[PDB]
Ligand binder design. Structure first.
Ligand SMILES: CC(=O)SCCNC(=O)CCNC(=O)[C@H](O)C(C)(C)COP(=O)(O)OP(=O)(O)OC[C@H]1O[C@@H](n2cnc3c(N)ncnc32)[C@H](O)[C@@H]1OP(=O)(O)O
Length: 203
């Protein structure tokens, strides 16, 4: 059936801190969670570049971003370094994370949330480009196939075999390259992140 659920989308406020930390725990393994302070930075320093999804009173989803000068600055950086790259006047929007409560996944929420973010970023003055550093979910199934080949592996159909990459693909993302050592604690992906970009010139 068609859900018919009352969803609200707004910028975070400081009061949302505890609920957003809770949301991080439920969506990601301990190795992939960002720490309490990074959540705080995002909602304190840059409320404009974040969105909270609420169902009733409850926070059920979040999408995070910051502004950087260019995607080259991401070469040879770990994820705990990226917060340092933020500049107020950065021409590139780096989407940092998308969080959907596991019980509410596979209902079109990720989709709707990302599309809104993309259109929201298009309308921000000065912004030329949107990039995200993602990761694979199913690589252990293809190991030891080289990841550089895995991230371009398409199915039938011509959509990417990895469901986390497909998610970006079907919203117009270009898979750019691998970012080795981006996530030190992510052994399933051999620490590698995946850089994707969005052409926003049409929106
Ligand atoms: C900003 C950044 O992206 S950087 C952060 C680092 N990580 C990332 O890059 C993002 C990682 N997260 C993801 O990509 C995940 O897919 C998530 C967390 C967004 C999943 O969120 P969801 O709300 O489940 O996404 P959504 O429901 O739109 O899509 C998931 C699948 O369900 C399908 N779906 C959509 N609506 C429905 C529905 N009503 N019923 C059943 N299935 C559905 C989609 O087609 C998709 O199918 P596929 O896996 O076969 O392609």
């Amino acid at each position: 059936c068609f859900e018919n659920n009352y969803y609200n989308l707004r910028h975070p406020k400081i009061e949302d801190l505890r609920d957003l930390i809770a949301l991080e725990t439920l969506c990601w393994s301990e190795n992939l969670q960002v720490d309490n302070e990074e959540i705080y930075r995002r909602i304190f320093k840059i409320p404009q570049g974040q969105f909270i999804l609420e169902l009733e009173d409850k926070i059920v989803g979040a999408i995070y971003s910051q502004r950087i000068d260019n995607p080259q600055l991401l070469d040879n950086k770990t994820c705990t370094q990226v917060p340092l790259l933020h500049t107020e006047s950065g021409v590139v929007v780096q989407l940092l994370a998308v969080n959907i409560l596991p019980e509410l996944q596979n209902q079109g929420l990720g989709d709707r949330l990302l599309e809104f973010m993309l259109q929201y970023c298009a309308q921000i003055s000065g912004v030329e480009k949107v990039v995200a550093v993602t990761l694979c979910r199913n690589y252990p199934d293809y190991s030891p196939m080289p990841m550089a080949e895995y991230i371009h592996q398409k199915n039938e159909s011509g959509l990417l075999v990895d469901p986390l990459l497909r998610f970006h693909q079907i919203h117009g993302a270009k898979i750019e390259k691998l970012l080795p050592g981006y996530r030190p604690k992510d052994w399933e992906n051999q620490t590698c992140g995946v850089l994707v970009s969005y052409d926003i010139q049409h929106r």
